[PDB]
Design a binder for this molecule. Structure first.
Ligand SMILES: CN[C@@H]1[C@@H](O)[C@@H](O[C@@H]2[C@@H](O)[C@H](O[C@H]3O[C@H](CN)CC[C@H]3NC(C)=O)[C@@H](N)C[C@H]2N)OC[C@]1(C)O
Ligand SMILES: CN[C@@H]1[C@@H](O)[C@@H](O[C@@H]2[C@@H](O)[C@H](O[C@H]3O[C@H](CN)CC[C@H]3NC(C)=O)[C@@H](N)C[C@H]2N)OC[C@]1(C)O
Lengths: 178, 189
């Protein structure tokens, strides 16, 4: 412990934090990180962990506009969790998601994310549970169903009640829509 | 208790603060809502207040009084069939007694800064009485066709064409291409 946490919007980042963020994401994902993945990281809030001026952890929360069963839903979508390897064994990830949960709770109706191989445990340990409904994405104007993502997407409710069996229609982006 | 949030500058006795929605108190949320209705003379709907939150706010205060606001929403659209990241400008308003003092200009200058650092294109929907201010800081009429998701299908937004304005974020965007916005409650533009 001894890690200072900062919640800042992309518009508030230093050049130092951006350059440190980019190096951390590449080390953590090492070629699994597209230029599209980097694009999805930007535009919203970043939760960052610092060990005495040098960045050790990061998670981002971006606003997405989806449809939950023909009803508009304001989603805080979680992107690019990464913790430096030497710092992965200190609960930094859990602290990251708890600030994430607060931001989602004070801004959006629903938090969404697409779990990775390393972690479907950490997200579950702070209240995230697998999304059970069908998932759809925009593909050249019309909506295709994202079968390859169902079971990999998890949600988190904040002060409401959302049918985790309903269909979700995500907004359009580059690369992986989820 | 209360700590410094985001960022602050001052211009001619007016303090301007850029805050994310997650960085505002419930009291500040209600002060803003009070500002929006009085400033729009009742035209401001609850769907429009929902469209205001979730992103950044620039807020102008005459001393302790909230006298100006603008919001920058992140929206995910398509240009033709290319993905484009949009900072959508919402709920621009200055209190009636505080017009003619350069507050809307300063609000938009901060808006341009936020957009330039975060998104590829700024977009807004302006009134015919409001196009003059955004033109004064580089915004141009969008020339392409506009589309909106209605019940899962894209329909042409004929009534909004000519009323949407854009501001390129240090790049190149063809303002004659068509725009396919994201789904939301209330008015899509
Ligand atoms: C079906 N089995 C899965 C397999 O489809 C795949 O899932 C991918 C998921 O990981 C990825 O998002 C994660 O990777 C992005 C770029 N690499 C950065 C954000 C990161 N999540 C954030 C919260 O850290 C999604 N954008 C796309 C998913 N297809 O890889 C994991 C998997 C379990 O094998
Ligand atoms: C085609 N002639 C226009 C006419 O369609 C209409 O345009 C509307 C536009 O104004 C409105 O957005 C403005 O009002 C929102 C809620 N009222 C708050 C945000 C505010 N823009 C923010 C930046 O101040 C859009 N959301 C919907 C548009 N239909 O009214 C104006 C008009 C000139 O008559």
């Amino acid at each position: 412990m001894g890690i200072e946490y900062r919640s800042l919007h992309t518009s508030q980042l230093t050049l130092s934090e951006k350059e440190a963020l980019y190096d951390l994401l590449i080390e953590g994902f090492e070629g699994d990180f597209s230029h599209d993945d980097f694009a999805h990281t930007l535009g919203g809030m970043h939760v960052m962990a610092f060990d005495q001026q040098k960045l050790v952890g990061h998670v981002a929360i971006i606003q997405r506009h989806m449809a939950l069963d023909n009803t508009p839903i304001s989603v805080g979508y979680v992107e690019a969790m990464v913790v430096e390897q030497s710092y992965r064994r200190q609960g930094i990830g859990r602290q990251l998601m708890l600030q994430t949960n607060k931001i989602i709770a004070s801004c959006y109706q629903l938090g969404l994310l697409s779990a990775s191989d390393d972690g479907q445990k950490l997200y579950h340990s702070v209240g995230w549970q697998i999304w059970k409904g069908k998932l759809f994405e925009l593909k050249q104007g019309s909506y295709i169903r994202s079968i390859e993502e169902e079971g990999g997407v998890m949600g988190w409710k904040a002060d409401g009640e959302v049918d985790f069996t309903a269909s979700l229609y995500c907004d359009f982006r580059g690369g992986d829509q989820w």
